[model samples]
Target: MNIFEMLRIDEGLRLKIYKDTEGYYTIGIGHLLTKSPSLNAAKSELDKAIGRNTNGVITKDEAEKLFNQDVDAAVRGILRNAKLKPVYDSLDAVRRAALINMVFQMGVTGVAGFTNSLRMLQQKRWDEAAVNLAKSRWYNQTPNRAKRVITTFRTGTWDAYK
Candidate 1:
């Protein structure tokens, strides 16, 4: 089980522009959009991450490396949320995985704010948890992905959810 593979399971590598959880334009494994930068340092990092002049086109290899650069930061963001820690830690690997997927999409702070959903998780109310998840704006924003995560939340196993 490589860390890269584990993260990739939910992210599903994509090279095209898509709206992310916060509705920001993003591409290449969750990289957010940015306008032209004046700072040399900023431009340098942008070039390294997305080829500043490539016009939204990047090879699969480039995207993979970009995602690798992002992994540590995302994990750290997930781990630093005190409110979610105990319950998150006690979850089984499958449910934990769904949490990771949520963190990847929404960041830990955002995932932690799912008040009813988090409460349901703490109480082991699987059905309520899934229903709460489905009630969010995120569900409407990405129904396909919400279905997958909600199913995992409901069943403790990643299953088809129509």
Candidate 2:
């Protein structure tokens, strides 16, 4: 089996390819976990907390609290079904994670069968392509996660030629 490793980046950047919901994690990471999504019914109140400070740091616990699926699942959603293969034949484990995260959040639509993004990726337009990704409607849903993946994509500065 292909051993997937996490990507590495410079300082001020932490890229993660795996996330967890209540129990499941990424593919290689999550095993024998629940696939049926837990439903949230009942109009219940939510928890209250302070807003982000200057640090802009999101703790692991915080991340786990926010997301229910493993990180790799989301990342795989981007790269799965050969979504990113046409553009990236191979990548460092971390880069793969980062790309998958971005694609998962973006989805198969809007150049996501990994085509449009692949075009920009082949051109080495890391930041530009990231911007394209961020501009999509997905950005509106999870700006924080989107920003994190976008940062990872640009920081890697790795691409290919068509």
Candidate 3:
């Protein structure tokens, strides 16, 4: 499956604001409103996207549009990393999706912090890469999601596909 479909399943759809695991104001498939330049700017953008006052609500289509944009940004973030580009280019579609998913959850810098894991990935050492990922706080914080991601890395399969 495509990265969009895989991420839709992983992130889940939300048309209204809700607190995420870290208590940030998030909406529309894991969009962190708190991460926006300002809460006012974030709210204004959401209202514009939905074409209404919204009062904190969003239409499915608008949410999907935002999700698509976010995914595109995530992909760009990965490719912009000089070290990650080559490793990302070497992977098959499924494995590439796994990396994008990680970037979606944790920004490119966060994923890049796994120096040894990226090294293993660059070397095509799937099992070693998985092992390194499993040893992270990312794995500890969200074990289920991280397990699926780790499995995808290990097997070069779409383990997160539902």
**Highest-TM-score candidate:** 3
The sequence of per-residue lDDT tens digits that candidate 3 reaches over residues 1-66 is 788887777778898887677666778898777755455766776677666797788888878888
Model 1, TM vs. native: 0.74
TM-score between model 2 and native: 0.44
How many clashes show up in model 3? 0
Which pairs of residues collide in model 3?
Answer: none
Candidate 3 TM-score over all chains jointly:
0.89
Q: Ten-residue segment with the worst summed lDDT in candidate 1?
A: 35-44
lDDT of each: 0.70, 0.44, 0.83
List model 2 lDDT by residue over 1-162, tens digit each. Answer: 111222111111221322343332222222212233321110010111113331323455544433434445555454554656655445555455566544433334543554666677767788787877676655666565556666666766333100
Residue-wise C-alpha lDDT for candidate 1, range 50-141, written one tens digit per residue: 75665556678888777866776666676777768766876887787778777877777888898778888988989887887888888998
- Per-residue error (Å), model 1, residue 114: 0.7
Indicate the worst ten consecutive residues by lDDT in candidate 2.
Answer: 41-50
* Backbone Cα, N, C clashes tallied per candidate: 0, 7, 0
- What stretches of model 1 exceed 4 Å from their correct place? 1-12, 16-23, 35-45, 48-55
